[PDB]
Amino acid sequence: TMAKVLAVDDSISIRQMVSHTLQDAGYEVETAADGREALAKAQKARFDVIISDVNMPVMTGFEFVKAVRMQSQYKFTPILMLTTETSPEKKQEGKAVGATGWLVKPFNPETLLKTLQRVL
Secondary structure, eight states: OOOEEEEEOSOHHHHHHHHHHHHHTTOEEEEESSHHHHHHHHHHSOOSEEEEETTOSSSOHHHHHHHHHTSGGGSSOOEEEEESOOOGGGGHHHHHHTOOEEEESSOOHHHHHHHHHTTO
């Protein structure tokens, strides 16, 4: 079809980069600036994958994924979290609340594309 993506980051450049890169790759992309706006969008549709920054406004990315995992329709949905941390020990919180995998910032298009590809 064209996998449906919800990307959440308060950074304008991050949203534009993700949106442009994924859309050029055949994805249907929807962006949000914070956890509140993201949750509201996720609640109203059915995204195939969610990409979310850990340092989101309104709530941490951890609380966001946790709230997302609380909705039955998103129990198995792959979630990819953006972080500046390369150290696994530093974000065990991610696996705990239900994150599927990570994407370390700063990344590039190929990193983004391959990483997404590998969690679907």
